[PDB]
Design a protein around this ligand. Structure first.
Ligand SMILES: CC(=O)c1ccc(N)cc1O
Length: 211
């Protein structure tokens, strides 16, 4: 059947939709379709191109109130990529507290982690019951499932600036150095390449965690 209303969604609403590039873009909800127990949402992107999407592949164009966000919430967030920014899907790993200077920690679907503000988040409209089950990469999906279900039990390595450690990249161990710590994240310098990455302190990419 063709619907005009479904839960709090209404045909003609402005929304965000997931493109095949896996980045998220503004559009209009132009149709809602049922096939028995299934629902699909037809979106016209601001370029006139159209997709028929599942409810976990659309998000509201508004910032969620803090009482609606939990560890494990499915969100779209601002993803900082060199000098350019995209909207990309992730999972809430931490809500604001004194130790994180009142920020949200996001674990993005590609395995990147970053702190963001409430004004950098958008809630997915129809998340799955197990919110991690639409993460395409198997190793990223299994990590989130264990993290979210074990919380608040979170093994982490205590690190200090200047500490020499081994860090994983492309399946092997690299000589690296701790440059800075920010809450649950550490900035690692790869010593041969002379470039940095922000990594979660509970990641088995850090040899001390792995051991
Ligand atoms: C270790 C880590 O930071 C991490 C793991 C899985 C994932 N989907 C996203 C992530 O950010």
């Amino acid at each position: 059947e063709n619907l005009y209303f479904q839960g709090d969604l209404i045909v003609s609403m402005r929304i965000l939709g997931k493109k095949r590039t896996k980045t998220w873009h503004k559009g209009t909800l132009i149709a809602i379709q049922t096939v028995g127990p299934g629902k699909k949402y037809k979106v016209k992107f601001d370029n006139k191109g159209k997709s028929l999407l599942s409810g976990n592949h659309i998000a509201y164009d508004y910032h969620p109130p803090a009482d609606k966000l939990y560890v494990g919430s499915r969100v779209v967030a601002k993803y900082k990529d060199g000098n350019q920014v995209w909207l990309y899907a992730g999972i809430v790993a931490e809500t604001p507290n004194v130790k994180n200077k009142l920020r949200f920690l996001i674990f993005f679907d590609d395995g990147y982690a970053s702190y963001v503000t409430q004004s950098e988040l958008y809630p997915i409209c129809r998340p799955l019951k197990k919110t991690w089950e639409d993460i395409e990469d198997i190793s990223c999906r299994d990590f989130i499932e264990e993290y979210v279900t074990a919380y608040p039990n979170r093994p982490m390595v205590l690190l200090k600036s200047g500490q020499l450690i081994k860090t994983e990249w492309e399946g092997t161990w690299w000589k690296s150095r701790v440059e800075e710590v920010d809450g649950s994240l550490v900035r690692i310098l790869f010593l041969d390449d002379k470039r940095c990455e922000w990594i979660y302190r509970g990641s088995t990419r850090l040899e001390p965690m792995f051991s």
